[PDB]
């Protein structure tokens, strides 16, 4: 659940960084 | 469709590491994209493979757990690129840690939840060409 919501966080950035 | 996409995706991340397995247009994009999405947070992904810790035993429950996770309030471009990377991630140290069919195993899972999972959010929000789009250079 760790490494989920921590790919979660730098998928949601990316999405961010991306709009 | 789904499958595809799946199989040239992991076929490919295997195929640049060393590892040989088993119209064409989003692929070559969401190579471009996992590959950035990847060195983008190298720092971040060091740390995952490090609390990975795959047995086959567990390799559905492991699978599971962080998938759910990652979905669980919602669905996003960035999400869905993190989730081919992770299945990357996976079916990597399985060919590392000596467990090539569970590469197999993960190609379906990936693809079972793509299909039953994603798939309407995807289609209510543009398919793959929408992506294409946003993803470009």
């Given at each position: 659940?760790?490494?989920?919501?921590?790919?979660?966080?730098?998928?949601?950035?990316?999405?961010?960084?991306?709009? | 469709?789904?499958?595809?996409?799946?199989?040239?995706?992991?076929?490919?991340?295997?195929?640049?590491?060393?590892?040989?397995?088993?119209?064409?247009?989003?692929?070559?994009?969401?190579?471009?994209?996992?590959?950035?999405?990847?060195?983008?947070?190298?720092?971040?992904?060091?740390?995952?493979?490090?609390?990975?810790?795959?047995?086959?035993?567990?390799?559905?429950?492991?699978?599971?757990?962080?998938?759910?996770?990652?979905?669980?309030?919602?669905?996003?471009?960035?999400?869905?690129?993190?989730?081919?990377?992770?299945?990357?991630?996976?079916?990597?140290?399985?060919?590392?840690?000596?467990?090539?069919?569970?590469?197999d195993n993960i190609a379906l899972w990936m693809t079972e939840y793509l299909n039953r999972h994603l798939h309407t959010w995807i289609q209510d929000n543009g398919?793959?060409?929408?992506?294409?789009?946003?993803?470009?250079?």
């Amino acid at each position: 659940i760790x490494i989920a919501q921590x790919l979660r966080x730098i998928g949601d950035x990316f999405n961010x960084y991306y709009a | 469709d789904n499958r595809e996409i799946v199989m040239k995706y992991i076929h490919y991340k295997l195929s640049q590491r060393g590892y040989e397995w088993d119209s064409e247009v989003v692929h070559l994009t969401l190579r471009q994209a996992g590959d950035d999405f990847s060195r983008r947070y190298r720092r971040d992904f060091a740390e995952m493979s490090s609390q990975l810790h795959l047995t086959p035993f567990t390799a559905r429950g492991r699978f599971a757990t962080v998938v759910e996770e990652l979905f669980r309030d919602g669905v996003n471009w960035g999400r869905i690129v993190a989730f081919f990377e992770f299945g990357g991630v996976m079916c990597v140290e399985s060919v590392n840690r000596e467990m090539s069919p569970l590469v197999d195993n993960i190609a379906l899972w990936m693809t079972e939840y793509l299909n039953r999972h994603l798939h309407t959010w995807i289609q209510d929000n543009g398919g793959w060409d929408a992506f294409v789009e946003l993803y470009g250079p």
